[PDB]
Chains A and B, each alone.
Chain A
């Protein structure tokens, strides 16, 4: 009977945190996914590391 009280609160906080985590995540990511043309250089670093692939694969 002692356990029954406790684990409910834990479980609710756990599921609640995941339903925050997902909800914040999609909302943040769905808001801020814009600056790729503002900073091109995420594809310049693609071409940088990609040149260190195109050279450094073999």
Chain B
């Protein structure tokens, strides 16, 4: 429903925890699994009442019918974000990860390989 795999993730996750969150992720993994199995189970929506039987055969229908109208008119919101600029601090952390490590390290490796030439000998 709500989640998905992105990359390689529930396994590939847990092992690997950037130090600036590292400790958190260990705890967070197990929390997530709890949410995962829970959500998958729940019902998604109930039935929606057979009015015909109830209206006819609950003959206090002044009450029933008024409550009916209020129920049928009854509108519903959604839950709330709170925690999803983490989603976006992601693209930031993704810079840090590649370019910030990618680049500096690629220049480092540049030297290690050029030095490989002579030390064949």
* 8 Å CB interface, A1-53 against B: 2-3, 5-6, 9-10, 13
| Interface hub of A5, A6, A9 (most chain B Cβ within 10 A) | A6
Residues of A within 8 A of B63 (CB): 9
Chain B contacts to A: CB under 8 angstroms: 49, 54, 57-60, 63-64, 67, 71
- Residue pair B60, A9 in contact (C-beta under 8 Å): yes
- Residue pair B67, A9 in contact (C-beta under 8 Å): no
Interface of A is mostly: helix
- Residue pair B60, A13 in contact (C-beta under 8 Å): yes
Residues of A within 8 A of B49 (CB): 2-3
- Residue pair A9, B71 in contact (C-beta under 8 Å): no
Q: Give A3 to B50 CA distance when docked, in angstroms.
A: 11
